[PDB]
């Protein structure tokens with residue numbers, strides 16, 4: 098089979114500065130280029146890498162016009178808008194170094210250059226994220242942040258921070274989405290003797306997995322939220338989840354409940370989360386995802402607190418780019434590139450989001466006209 | 471029929487809840503709420519004096535302990551029952567810990583005081599709370615949460631800066647020093663995380679059945695275990711053989727870049743040695759909730775010590791065992807222990823007893839001859 102020749106690859110990755118020189122395990126950076134440069138160049142392909150992706154006349158905007166393959170990463174996402182896709186005359190393959198391709202306008206991608214392939218490294222960092230969810234649940238429930246601040250400030254007042262400290266044992270935790278991440282969140286929660294583990298997804302777990310993990314499907318989202326002490330969002334960003342967690346839906350959660358979001362920032366309405374915290378309807382919010390990214394320096398969820406001055410466990414978008422995760426998604430990007438560059442187009446079907454002008458996944462909403470290859 | 475004891479003076483040393491304990495009645499373990507004991511004691515004709523004033527020369531604790539028959543302490547704000555104080559406690563018969571860990575009592579001195587006083591604690595009351603806090607703290611350290619949250623609140627954004635020290639717990643080896651009620655519950659919570667191995671070191675082992683259920687392996691030598699672990703968690707009591715156990719020499723057997731968690735007692739580590747190991751990068755992190763002494767002095771080195779990247783500190787005040795869920799259980803348990811004494815039945819749960827009738831009543835405070843387990 099004839100290999101494709103002299104393919105222009107454009108990678109939009111985060112700037113690792115001195116960190117990426119000092120810690121070579123930062124593969125997903127403009128410095129280390131996912132370990133791809135020599136492997137591409139030895140085949141006669143070219144690689145252009147940038148972190149400059151947001152401003153008018155950005156390097157991304159110039160280079161995308163003749164890139165055949167565009168590698169993006171959700172931690173520093175080159176937004177492939179309809180406007181940009183219309184200028185990307187050579188684009189055939191959009192590879193996400195990570196999981197979650199919602200920074201691509203997938204409807205526009207299906208109408209671009211005959212229908213481009215949008216692929217991501219399915220399963221590469223799902224464990225990383227599930228760990229981060231459980232961590233964030235415990236940090237919020239146990240009131241870690243203001244307690245650690247009290248220590249670093251030289252203070253000592255056990256009652257001040259114990260007054261909002263709970264145990265996770267005996268609490269009800271619900272996941273929105275029970276795919277690779279949500280299932281792994283419930284598998285890590287099992288050992289904590291929560292009162293119940295609940296999920297909401299139009300793609301259910303098998304009865305065998307329900308019994309093994311010890312969890313229950315709730316058919317209505319609002320009915321699940323009303324039963325939970327903790328809610329974790331683990332679904333992709335698509336038209337029906339954008340702004341899903343607005344004031345009306347957050348009002349269905351219990352007063353004093355804890356919300357975790359390691360999915361996508363735009364699934365919540367940031368002002369509505371900030372207001373719920375401000376009034377004490379939420380005890381806490383945490384996670385690692387923001388809209389847009391980089392998160393603006395004045396984004397309200399950097400500093401929003403509950404009425405006790407706690408309840409914020411936000412971090413930069415990092416869970417999916419742990420050093421352990423990066424080794425796996427760097428390897429997976431190479432595998433997806435090799436499928437295309439070899440001329441075999443022998444993608445893992447689970448890596449495909451859109452392909453040949455159609456959605457190739459069930460996970461971006463309940464659709465007609467999905468073609469699983 | 472057994473005659474109840476009469477007009478017993480009870481002294482409780484608890485933390486000051488200030489306005490918090492008025493606003494949140496679930497803060498039972500405070501001078502405000504008195505573990506919900508006051509009416510229950512007073513209706514029997516007993517007296518209760520409660521204080522947070524326990525450290526200064528001529529403290530309320532020092533005055534009242536001289537004729538208290540029962541002294542209730544709490545590890546979060548511990549009235550240290552030193553040999554000097556026990557020698558002045560002329561009426562003391564029962565020392566009850568509101569919580570778990572009675573090392574703030576000189577237990578050797580307690581065995582020689584007033585014919586051997588009973589030292590009891592509420593075994594099992596907050597062991598889940600602590601085990602949760604351990605797993606949380608392990609994850610916070612391994613995933614580099616603290617400096618990442620600080621970056622966000624400061625208005626900054628640099629993924630590489632904090633991802634460069636962010637690992638997954640999957641595939642790491644975790645060891646526990648102690649596999650009693652907390653250590654076993656830590657391993658039960660780690661099971662779902664697909665650690666490479668779960669290890670323990672304890673002279674009281676798990677049953678083979680429990681080892682296979684949880685999926686863990688006993689290591690016979692402590693230094694051997696430390697050299698294999700990426701994460702170590704300390705879950706044993708404070709006694710002569712564990713005081714200063716985690717000194718520079720033992721910490722040097724841990725892997726470079728390892729994470730150390732201590733929710734047991736502060737004095738099990740040598741704080742200057744932990745700070746030095748962190749500062750040179752031998753530890754990537756230290757965290758937990760316990761300090762020596764308590765309250766932790768404002769300048770305690772572990773409030774502010776960091777790894778060379780400016781992270782690696784997940785310290786909190788002594789709080790894990792005093793979650794609102796825990797306080798309900800240890801308040802109820804203190805009442806149960808008090809009722810055993812005040813009823814004249816002395817029908818304590820054997821597992822609640824630390825020393826009793828002049829002898830250690832537990833195997834958990836070191837390997838001893840002259841341990842008398844009741845039953």
Ligand SMILES: NC(=O)c1ccc[n+]([C@@H]2O[C@H](COP(=O)([O-])OP(=O)(O)OC[C@H]3O[C@@H](n4cnc5c(N)ncnc54)[C@H](O)[C@@H]3O)[C@@H](O)[C@H]2O)c1
Pocket residue numbers: 195196197198220222223226273274275276277278279297298299300331332333334337338359360361385386414415416417418459460461462
């Ligand atoms: N924070 C990070 O670093 C990080 C990294 C990986 C993935 N993610 C995000 O997490 C998402 C999920 O990852 P995954 O590996 O679990 O995906 P997955 O496709 O295995 O599972 C997602 C599940 O969400 C369900 N879903 C879709 N819409 C839903 C809705 N309205 N309500 C409930 N469930 C719904 C789907 O049916 C599916 O089962 C990704 O799409 C990405 O946005 C974040």
Ligand SMILES: NC(=O)c1ccc[n+]([C@@H]2O[C@H](COP(=O)([O-])OP(=O)(O)OC[C@H]3O[C@@H](n4cnc5c(N)ncnc54)[C@H](O)[C@@H]3O)[C@@H](O)[C@H]2O)c1
Pocket residue numbers: 569570571572594596597600647648649650651652653671672673674705706707708711712733734735759760788789790791792833834835836
């Ligand atoms: N941070 C908190 O709020 C909090 C709350 C409760 C308990 N604690 C501390 O945790 C300790 C453990 O509580 P637990 O409920 O698990 O007690 P436990 O008695 O069930 O178990 C303690 C175990 O440690 C073992 N041990 C003793 N010396 C050891 C040594 N040198 N090496 C290894 N193992 C050793 C014992 O054999 C025993 O199995 C308490 O004594 C207390 O000091 C902390």
